[model samples]
Target: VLYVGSKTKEGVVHGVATVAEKTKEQVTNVGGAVVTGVTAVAQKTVEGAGSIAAATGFVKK
Candidate 1:
């Protein structure tokens, strides 16, 4: 998320923007959520592939 604070005739007033301060918690949280969702999709795909292989009798009984 981008946060820009406001006020002025020139349409500008700032502290952090000039100092270039930022936090990583937001980025980390989003990254973690993405990894979790992708892992779930990968697990489901493996399960489906295994079931198809078994039904065709390709694997040893």
Candidate 2:
């Protein structure tokens, strides 16, 4: 009976660990997507600035 309980406890622990690992993977995937989106937006902003500068000859006057 004791050995059985020990095995059951170990199985539950493994299940919990697996769930934690999956959650971590999901969080990391979301983080990577956010970073990529932010990078894309930043790059577009820079490109727009370059275009505006060219159009205005880099001076308001």
Candidate 3:
């Protein structure tokens, strides 16, 4: 999940951290599925909110 605060004409103004992960290994383990070895998969972070908007080309007013 993304978290933001404040406002500015330039861009994002706060830090972002993962709020939750439903598919996380811990969740699966708690559900009684034997956890297996794993590897970290890191995707490029969306530069900022605008990056997402730009990628989708969606606009709102």
Candidate 4:
């Protein structure tokens, strides 16, 4: 996050937008992909949990 970049460097190399530039350039994209994958896997796990709950009579029916 910005906290990581904010702690390490002088935080100014270009114009006025001296932010986590390296992360915004590349690592954020990688993090975005990981976020997508994690979201998908989380959905699948929730579906599996639904089935498990039904099988165990945890549901109302």
lDDT of 2 by residue, 1-61 (tens): 4554443322121222222233333234432222211111112333343231221223435
- Report the error of model 2 at residue 19, Å: 24
Candidate 1 residue-wise lDDT, 5-59, digit = tens: 6852332334432333657434344322222111111123433532212213134
Q: What TM-score should be assigned to candidate 1?
A: 0.11
Work out the TM-score per prediction. 0.11, 0.10, 0.18, 0.11
Q: lDDT of candidate 4?
A: 0.30
- RMSD in order of candidates: 20.7, 22.7, 15.4, 18.5
Which one is best on lDDT? 3
Q: Which should have the higher lDDT, number 3 or number 4?
A: 3
**Candidate 2 clashes between residue pairs 3 or more apart in a chain or in different chains:** none
Instruction: Report the number of the highest-TM-score candidate.
Output: 3
Clash numbers, per candidate: 0, 0, 0, 0
- Superposed model 4: Cα runs more than 4 Å off: 1-18, 23-33, 36-61
Candidate 2 lDDT for residue 54: 21
Q: Look at candidate 4 and give me any clashing residue pairs.
A: none
Candidate 2 accuracy as lDDT: 0.26
- Candidate 2 accuracy as TM-score: 0.10
How many angstroms is residue 21 displaced in model 4 relative to the true structure, after the best TM-score fit? 1.4
Overall lDDT per candidate, in order of appearance: 0.32, 0.26, 0.39, 0.30
